[PDB]
Amino acid sequence: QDRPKFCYLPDDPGVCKAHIPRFYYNPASNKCKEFIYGGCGGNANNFETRAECRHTCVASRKGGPRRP
Numbered sequence: 368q369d370r371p372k373f374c375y376l377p378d379d380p381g382v383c384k385a386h387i388p389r390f391y392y393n394p395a396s397n398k399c400k401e402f403i404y405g406g407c408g409g410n411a412n413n414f415e416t417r418a419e420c421r422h423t424c425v426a427s428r429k430g431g432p433r434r435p
Contacts, residue, residue: 370394373411374424381408390414392424 378391383405390401391412399420404413414420 369427370424371411376410376412378402379408379410379412381405383407388415390416390420392420394424397425 374392375394376391378389378393378400380389380402381404385405387404387406388401389404390399391414392399399414399417401417414423
């Protein structure tokens with residue numbers, strides 16, 4: 368893909384018992400979401416905003432003149 372494969376990795380907050388506002392890209396639904404990060408496991412898919420999350424994987428695209 369023209370985009371990073373780590374953007375496909377499901378949200379991986381890990382297995383810890385904490386709470387940190389984090390974000391991941393969901394290509395399967397073509398949408399950004401916020402998740403609660405712990406502190407145990409994780410991946411390269413761990414942002415702090417939706418505008419970043421889309422600019423990471425949903426970059427370089429020109430198709431659909433303002434879809435409904």
